[PDB]
Structure 1
Amino acid sequence: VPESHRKILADIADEVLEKFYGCGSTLPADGSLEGATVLDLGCGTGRDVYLASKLVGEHGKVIGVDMLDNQLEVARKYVEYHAEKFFGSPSRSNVRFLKGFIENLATAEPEGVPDSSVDIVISNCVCNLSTNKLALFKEIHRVLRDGGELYFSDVYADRRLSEAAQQDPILYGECLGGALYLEDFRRLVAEAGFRDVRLVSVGPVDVSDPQLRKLVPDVQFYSCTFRCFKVATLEATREDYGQSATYLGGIGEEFKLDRFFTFPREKPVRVDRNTAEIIRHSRLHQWFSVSAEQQHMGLFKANDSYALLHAPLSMQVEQLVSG
């Protein structure tokens, strides 16, 4: 748990923390959340929704969605509690909880999530239990505004799992059985409208149980945090238009966009046009200066890892996990 989050979580209601299921949804840099609308898919008792409530502040909004009746009951019980805690009055909540399948946010109760209404969609380990991944990614694309991002952690494989592995109930329940091969994931989210997948962090996921392991013998599983921006002008490729971007400060000493792009305060960093357009059209434009496009110069190479930058997603992940 990040240090900045500890103080906030210490103010969240015991019952919310005690009954919260799963790992916390990882969040973009705290300062970048100010005034944003955040949607947590699979919100449970609302631990992450309440954490985000404080971070987005009074001008931001947070929405949680879940289909677990009894978790949502807990979440809804504490709307006033956390409005008092964070904003000085029980009437000043910026959160709401909706009941629905994450594969159809338009039919959630008591209200659906509108088109183009959300800045950041967050989630942890929800995909591999989804009954329809493509439908889910399409829904996420629909609710995001232009410049918004899906910033999420899930489990992926370095190869395609066998049918036997995909049918196993213990692997299923562990979020392993439903894991996609990283290249299949890339193609699926591209079909949904997400043209550029950025790797934020990656850790290994072990399957040591010998019985289960026999179903996935040489598979390497990874926990990956990706950010996928909805930006109309993105291309499938990372092209050089001679641009630089400079982080202006205000939301940390540096801004780390992904494993390839770190922006020190007030220093220019050369960027490909997709990265430029992400900064310009997303909420990040508030803290950045991005130079004008020049003539196309070909593929972007002005990065100390440019070869990996253009490599398949499996190569980025395997090489960045460690060593």
Structure 2
Amino acid sequence: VPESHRKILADIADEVLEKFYGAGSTLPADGSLEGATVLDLGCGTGRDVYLASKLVGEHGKVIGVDMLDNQLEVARKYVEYHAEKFFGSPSRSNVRFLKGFIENLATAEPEGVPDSSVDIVISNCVCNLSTNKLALFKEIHRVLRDGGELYFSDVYADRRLSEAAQQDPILYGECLGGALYLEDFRRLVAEAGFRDVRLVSVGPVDVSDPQLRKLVPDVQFYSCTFRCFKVATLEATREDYGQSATYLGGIGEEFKLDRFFTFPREKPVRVDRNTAEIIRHSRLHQWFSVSAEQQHMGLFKANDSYALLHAPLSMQVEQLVS
């Protein structure tokens, strides 16, 4: 748990924490959250929604969605609690909890999530149980506004699982069975509209049980945090138009966009046009200066890991580990 969060977690109602299923949805840098609308897919008892509530402040909004009666009944009955503790009155809540399938957010209950309404969509380990991954990615792209982002963690594999592994119940329930090969992930998400997938962090996932392991003998699984911006001008490739971006301060000593780009306070960093556009069209614009497009110079090479920046996801994931 990030230090900045511990105090806020100490304030969240014990019953929310005690009954929360799963690991926490990781959040972008806290400062970047101010005033954002954030949606948590598979929100459970609301741990992450309530943490976001505080961080987005009273101008922001937070939405939780889940299909477990159950955990939502608990989420819903602590809204006032948390408005008082964060904003001084039972009546100033900026959260709501919706009941529904995450693959169809338009029909969730009491109200749907409309088109182009969310700045950040977060989730941890919801995809590999999903019934249609494409439909989930398309629904995310729908609810995001331009410049918004899916900032999420899930389990992926370094190769395509066999049919026998995809059918196994214990593998399925551990979010391994339904894991995509990273490259299949990248095509699928692009088919949904996300043309540029940025690696934030990766951890190994191990199958130690030798019976399970025999179904997936040499497969390497990873827990990957990716960020996928919805920005109309992104291309499939990472092109140099001569630009530089400069982090102006305000949300930390330095801003780490992904594993290739870190921006120190007031130091110009050369960027590809995709990165320049993400910065310009997302909420991040508020803390950056981005220089104007020159003439095209070819593929972007002005990064000390440029070869990896252009390589398949597999290769990026495997080296950030090694």
TM-score w.r.t. structure 2 length? Answer: 1.00
Kindly state the Cα deviation for residue 172 of structure 1 after the two structures are TM-superposed. 0.2
Distance (Å, rounded) in 1 between the aligned partners of 2:108 and 2:169: 28
Structure 1 residues 227-285: Cα deviation after superposition (integer angstroms, max 9, x where no partner): 00000000000000000000000000000000000000000000000000000000000
Aligned to 2:147: 147
Range that drifts further, 313-322 or 14-23: 313-322
Kindly state the Cα deviation for residue 20 of structure 1 after the two structures are TM-superposed. 0.2
Distance (Å, rounded) in 2 between the aligned partners of 1:168 and 1:249: 49
Distance (Å, rounded) in 2 between the aligned partners of 1:150 and 1:141: 8
Kindly state the Cα deviation for residue 321 of structure 1 after the two structures are TM-superposed. 1.2
Aligned to 2:318: 318
Aligned to 2:231: 231
Secondary structure in structure 2 of the residue aligned to 1:251: coil
Distance (Å, rounded) in 2 between the aligned partners of 1:85 and 1:304: 46
The runs of 5 or more residues in structure 2 that have no matched partner are none
Distance (Å, rounded) in 2 between the aligned partners of 1:146 and 1:317: 27
Distance (Å, rounded) in 2 between the aligned partners of 1:87 and 1:249: 27
Kindly state the Cα deviation for residue 306 of structure 1 after the two structures are TM-superposed. 0.1
Distance (Å, rounded) in 2 between the aligned partners of 1:265 and 1:127: 36
The runs of 5 or more residues in structure 1 that have no matched partner are none
Percent identity of paired positions between Structure 1 and Structure 2: 100
Distance (Å, rounded) in 2 between the aligned partners of 1:196 and 1:288: 20
Aligned length: 322
Aligned to 2:11: 11
Distance (Å, rounded) in 2 between the aligned partners of 1:169 and 1:143: 32
Secondary structure in structure 2 of the residue aligned to 1:146: strand
Distance (Å, rounded) in 1 between the aligned partners of 2:172 and 2:106: 27
Q: Give the ranges of 4+ consecutive aligned residues of structure 1 lying more than 3 Å apart after TM superposition.
A: none
Distance (Å, rounded) in 1 between the aligned partners of 2:7 and 2:188: 38
Kindly state the Cα deviation for residue 93 of structure 1 after the two structures are TM-superposed. 0.2
Secondary structure in structure 1 of the residue aligned to 2:199: strand
Distance (Å, rounded) in 2 between the aligned partners of 1:197 and 1:17: 31
Secondary structure in structure 2 of the residue aligned to 1:289: strand
Distance (Å, rounded) in 2 between the aligned partners of 1:25 and 1:158: 23
Kindly state the Cα deviation for residue 29 of structure 1 after the two structures are TM-superposed. 0.1
**Alpha carbon RMSD of aligned pairs, Å?**
0.3
Structure 1 residues 56-84: Cα deviation after superposition (integer angstroms, max 9, x where no partner): 00000000000000000000010000000
Distance (Å, rounded) in 2 between the aligned partners of 1:321 and 1:235: 27
Distance (Å, rounded) in 2 between the aligned partners of 1:30 and 1:252: 9
Distance (Å, rounded) in 1 between the aligned partners of 2:169 and 2:105: 27
Secondary structure in structure 2 of the residue aligned to 1:35: coil
Distance (Å, rounded) in 1 between the aligned partners of 2:100 and 2:166: 25
TM-score w.r.t. structure 1 length? Answer: 1.00
Distance (Å, rounded) in 1 between the aligned partners of 2:291 and 2:89: 44
Secondary structure in structure 1 of the residue aligned to 2:122: strand
Structure 1 residues 81-103: Cα deviation after superposition (integer angstroms, max 9, x where no partner): 00000000000000000000000
Secondary structure in structure 1 of the residue aligned to 2:135: helix
Structure 1 residues 164-186: Cα deviation after superposition (integer angstroms, max 9, x where no partner): 00000000000000000000000
Distance (Å, rounded) in 1 between the aligned partners of 2:321 and 2:3: 23
Distance (Å, rounded) in 2 between the aligned partners of 1:171 and 1:288: 44
Distance (Å, rounded) in 2 between the aligned partners of 1:132 and 1:71: 23
Distance (Å, rounded) in 2 between the aligned partners of 1:320 and 1:279: 23
Distance (Å, rounded) in 2 between the aligned partners of 1:141 and 1:270: 28
Aligned to 1:84: 84
Secondary structure in structure 2 of the residue aligned to 1:129: coil
Kindly state the Cα deviation for residue 10 of structure 1 after the two structures are TM-superposed. 0.2
Aligned to 2:122: 122
Structure 1 residues 266-305: Cα deviation after superposition (integer angstroms, max 9, x where no partner): 0000000000000000000000000000000000000000
